[PDB]
Motif scaffolding. Structure first.
Motif, PDB file in Angstrom:
ATOM      1  N   UNK A  21       0.657  -1.232   0.105  1.00  0.00           N
ATOM      2  CA  UNK A  21       0.131   0.004  -0.131  1.00  0.00           C
ATOM      3  C   UNK A  21       0.875   1.186  -0.119  1.00  0.00           C
ATOM      4  N   UNK A  22       1.621   1.472   1.116  1.00  0.00           N
ATOM      5  CA  UNK A  22       2.587   2.395   1.159  1.00  0.00           C
ATOM      6  C   UNK A  22       3.828   1.739   1.472  1.00  0.00           C
ATOM      7  N   UNK A  46       2.897   9.290   2.371  1.00  0.00           N
ATOM      8  CA  UNK A  46       1.622   9.762   2.560  1.00  0.00           C
ATOM      9  C   UNK A  46       1.011   9.206   3.889  1.00  0.00           C
ATOM     10  N   UNK A 155      -2.723  -0.632  10.531  1.00  0.00           N
ATOM     11  CA  UNK A 155      -3.983  -0.189  10.620  1.00  0.00           C
ATOM     12  C   UNK A 155      -4.622  -0.460  12.064  1.00  0.00           C
ATOM     13  N   UNK A 170     -11.732   6.531  13.325  1.00  0.00           N
ATOM     14  CA  UNK A 170     -12.039   6.581  11.764  1.00  0.00           C
ATOM     15  C   UNK A 170     -12.091   5.083  11.138  1.00  0.00           C
ATOM     16  N   UNK A 172     -11.579   2.170   8.715  1.00  0.00           N
ATOM     17  CA  UNK A 172     -10.210   1.292   7.867  1.00  0.00           C
ATOM     18  C   UNK A 172     -10.513  -0.311   7.692  1.00  0.00           C
ATOM     19  N   UNK A 173      -9.957  -0.313   6.691  1.00  0.00           N
ATOM     20  CA  UNK A 173      -9.887  -1.787   6.119  1.00  0.00           C
ATOM     21  C   UNK A 173      -9.887  -2.101   4.772  1.00  0.00           C
TER      22      UNK A 173
END
Lengths: 288, 77
Positions: A21-22, A46, A155, A170, A172-173
């Motif tokens: 991902x990153x 990011x 995460x 928040x 996420x997933x």
């Protein structure tokens, strides 16, 4: 910060294995001969920092045989790589569909060892107030004797009350595994992981390593799907691969009965990763 | 259409202060099938256009989704 299991600059990159991902991932042999995995996170920083850190603190407790074990890190010269044991077999998905891999497929047993294995994995983390939030076939690497290990905690979240935390942050997933309740409401619990597990569960049974595939009908969400089958419409034995007549009629009725129990509309009616880990073994038992 | 529709959504994002650069990052993450992390702004804008997003969620071939990826990419410049 509080840590010093910190390695420093190896060689120049031999383009290998993965992509993330990153970040990227490379297979790099160390000075001592050790096969080690490297998750370089310099591509697109990011907010790739907070994840990197949470994966250092949450994972520097590396004490389990069902979690990917982290060796070291590096924050030297803006870079932020992470070091792990190389996993011979890649993730679980690569053995359930993906593409290639000779010697045909996995057995039902081998599938169950890896279902139960993965469960202790989560159960453990739920014992330690840790929500993984991103439980999926890709995050469940295997090693030399096909032993499951959880990964990418980036995460993840930790709780105060140690277990009974019903905290909210928040959303996420991975879009198919996400708890819908979690999604629609925002309130995050440890069960949202149980849901995600139910998804993997079938994703093992079916080999529809698609979970969410946007090409067949309104039978797109394997979660929505195998549910409508085994929850009511047919206890379908038609959902699985060339798994053959290998699965016992009884173990199969359990294995799913649970996987469906994991996917209940509300977390309320889900089982703690404790039961799920017992039921799993029980079905592997029911089989032989 | 789809290019006409896609624009409506980039508009909201910008009109609703949503940093559209980030919004793109999630739409990539969403279609690839990577862990997503929408903002409150962004997530509720999307569910209007992709209803089944919680479950099915932004496919690769979803026309509108392809258009929106571009419709954003341009606007970023």
């Amino acid at each position: 910060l509080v840590d010093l299991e910190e390695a420093t600059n190896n060689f120049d990159h031999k383009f290998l294995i993965g992509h993330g991902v990153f970040g990227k991932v490379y297979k790099g042999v160390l000075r001592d001969g050790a096969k080690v995995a490297l998750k370089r996170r310099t591509p697109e920083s990011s907010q790739g920092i907070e994840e990197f850190e949470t994966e250092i603190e949450t994972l520097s407790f590396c004490r389990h045989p069902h979690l990917v074990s982290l060796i070291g890190f590096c924050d030297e010269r803006n870079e932020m790589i992470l070091i792990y044991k190389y996993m011979e077999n890649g993730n679980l998905k690569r053995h359930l569909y993906g593409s290639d891999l000779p010697t045909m497929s996995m057995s039902w047993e081998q599938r169950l060892e890896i279902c139960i294995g993965a469960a202790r994995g989560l159960h453990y983390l739920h014992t330690r107030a840790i929500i993984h939030r991103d439980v999926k076939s890709i995050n469940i690497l295997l090693d030399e004797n096909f032993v499951p290990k959880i990964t990418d905690f980036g995460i993840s979240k930790k709780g105060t009350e140690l277990g009974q935390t019903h905290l909210s942050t928040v959303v996420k997933g991975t879009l198919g595994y996400i708890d819908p309740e979690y999604f629609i409401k925002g309130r995050l619990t440890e069960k949202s992981d149980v849901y995600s597990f139910g998804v993997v569960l079938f994703e093992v049974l079916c080999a529809r390593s698609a979970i969410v595939q946007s090409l067949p009908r309104e039978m797109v969400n394997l979660a929505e799907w195998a549910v409508e089958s085994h929850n009511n419409g047919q206890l379908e034995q038609i959902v699985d691969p060339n798994l053959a007549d290998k699965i016992r009629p009884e173990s199969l009725r359990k294995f799913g009965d649970t996987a469906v129990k994991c996917l209940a509309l509300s977390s309320e009616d889900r089982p703690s990763m404790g039961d799920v880990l017992w039921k799993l073994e029980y079905a592997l038992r029911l089989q032989e | 259409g789809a290019v006409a529709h896609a624009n409506s959504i980039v508009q909201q994002l910008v009109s609703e202060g949503a940093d559209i650069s980030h919004t793109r990052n999630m739409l990539r993450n969403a279609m690839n099938g990577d862990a997503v992390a929408f903002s409150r702004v962004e997530q509720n804008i999307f569910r209007q256009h992709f209803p089944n997003m919680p479950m099915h969620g932004i496919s690769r071939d979803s026309e509108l989704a392809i258009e929106l990826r571009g419709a954003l990419r341009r606007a970023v410049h």
